[PDB]
Amino acid sequence: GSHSMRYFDTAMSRPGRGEPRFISVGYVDDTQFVRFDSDAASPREEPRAPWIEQEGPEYWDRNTQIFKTNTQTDRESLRNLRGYYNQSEAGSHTLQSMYGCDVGPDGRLLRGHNQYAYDGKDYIALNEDLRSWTAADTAAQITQRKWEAARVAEQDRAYLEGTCVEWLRRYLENGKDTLERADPPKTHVTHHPISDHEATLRCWALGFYPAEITLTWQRDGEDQTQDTELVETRPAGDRTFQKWAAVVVPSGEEQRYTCHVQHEGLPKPLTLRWEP
């Protein structure tokens, strides 16, 4: 496969400070294209990517309505959730939703997703068959019964197999110059003496898109997994990402180390070494 569209919705109750805040951001791969916040002066689905701006008034209205409705539904679910767990009305709780579809290079459905987490813990999820559910506990089983009784999975499947894949294919076409362009990482190795005895070799990867990348250090061709410090891939802010892997090596042994970079925008994976 090669592409995904996904919505990340967060509903957080805040007793004594109004109704639960709802925010939904939509992404095509690692590119955000829309956002919605119930706390905005006038909540509406708004563009966060150039290629989505061409969508008409009808698109913005329908999605604004969908999210205003999801805001109301998550507020109702947070209330239900509190009861399922015998929790008081005084605490703050979070309900997150993650849904969408992945398509292969040919644009056909690879897989659909529709899952929920309550207070950071998986709650219920539509199985890969788009027909059944996995409930994490007895409270989620209540949600499962209700969804099964209303034949909810059939609707989700209809969205994930049709509407969802259709939108993603349309977004991919409209934003092909960026969405379908892989920017390979610009790479280099820095060297930082620690003492007379050791030095840090840090291997950099910058300016790459999409975020998926693997940086590994080898000493004498042997991977140094346990001895490598790896930071989390981080957004540079211009749509691209950055990452680095470091290893503390004995002074004079730097040449026994090689960094290997794998990224889809690279024809072949790179091998680098500190060049003094």
Partner: peptide, 8 residues
Amino acid sequence: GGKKRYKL
């Protein structure tokens, strides 16, 4: 485009 979800 998003989808109207269901109450838990």
